[PDB]
């Protein structure tokens, strides 16, 4: 499903992303926008045989298992298919584990290139949270 901006914001807030390990809600809404335009079914195939899945484009080489990715570590202990659900539960759980790695949201290139150091709060402003 394709989330509306505020709709995803409300959902992400309910899923405890507002201020998780020091990152405000806007950071996550912004990251979702640039990673997949709020599309839970977004997928991106990579040259190394791995694929990025979901609204936060999580990779199958390190984070989830799709049963066909060379050297998969499945750090999030989940099938990549769980990351394509209209229910963002799994994508959020995994995103939290990723951000708990020593590099914060820098794990997401799109966030680094389009959200980092910006007025990310603008992404939730206007929404009734």
């Amino acid at each position, epitope marked *: 499903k394709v989330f509306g901006r505020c709709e995803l914001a409300a959902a992400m807030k309910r*899923h*405890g992303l507002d*201020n998780y*390990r020091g990152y405000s809600l806007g950071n996550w809404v912004c990251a979702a926008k640039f990673e997949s335009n709020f599309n839970t079914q977004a997928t991106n195939r990579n040259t190394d045989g791995s694929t990025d899945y979901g609204i936060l484009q999580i990779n199958s080489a390190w984070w989830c298992n799709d049963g066909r990715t060379p050297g998969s570590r499945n750090l999030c*202990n989940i099938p990549c298919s769980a990351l394509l659900s209209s229910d963002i539960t799994a994508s959020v759980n995994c995103a939290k*584990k990723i951000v708990s*790695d*020593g590099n914060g949201m820098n794990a997401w290139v799109a966030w680094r290139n389009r959200c980092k150091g910006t007025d990310v709060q603008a992404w939730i402003r206007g929404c009734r949270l």
Partner: antibody
Amino acid sequence: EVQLQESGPSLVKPSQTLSLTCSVTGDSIIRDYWSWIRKFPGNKLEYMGYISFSGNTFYHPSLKSRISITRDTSKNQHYLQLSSVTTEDTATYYCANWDGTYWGEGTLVTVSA
Amino acid sequence: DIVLTQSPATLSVTPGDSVSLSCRASQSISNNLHWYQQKSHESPRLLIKYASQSISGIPSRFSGSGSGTDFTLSINSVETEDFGMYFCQQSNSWPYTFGGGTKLEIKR
């Protein structure tokens, strides 16, 4: 059949270093984040720290700079080292994966002279 | 550090009855509150993660609710094997911290 087995000196003297090994079997160290938790005599739990897939560590400030968590990907083990211990470090130590779905048996390390 | 306060300290119950355990955080932690059970001479066992998400393999009588600074672990009809310690733990901010725990004891 994922199992975590803790091992290390059950007795350490004040000012010495407490060391514990978490041997993981049925799973790989590089396939998860690993944590160390301790339970004091009165049922008080303290999260000591964890080490991520990248090797980055997060230590509880309560432990000052006495704690060190490392891993050995070839032996599939991660280790906890706590230096300059005092009787207050006497506790049951547990290792677990960051998800909290897998836990070691728990080893009581007593600090005494 | 976020302080988690659990109550009651001890809860006596007759098997078959339902009970609710409380955990309050000194600051908002969203849904980043997890519930652990720990029985005598055993390691902690994860029951509920992220306030209300069930852990595959945990009995359905266990459920969690709440958000922000107020959380509740509910046990619909406590059973014989459910007595022991229950702790809540937050993962919203480092360092992770645990509540003081609630002892579930058998009423006689």
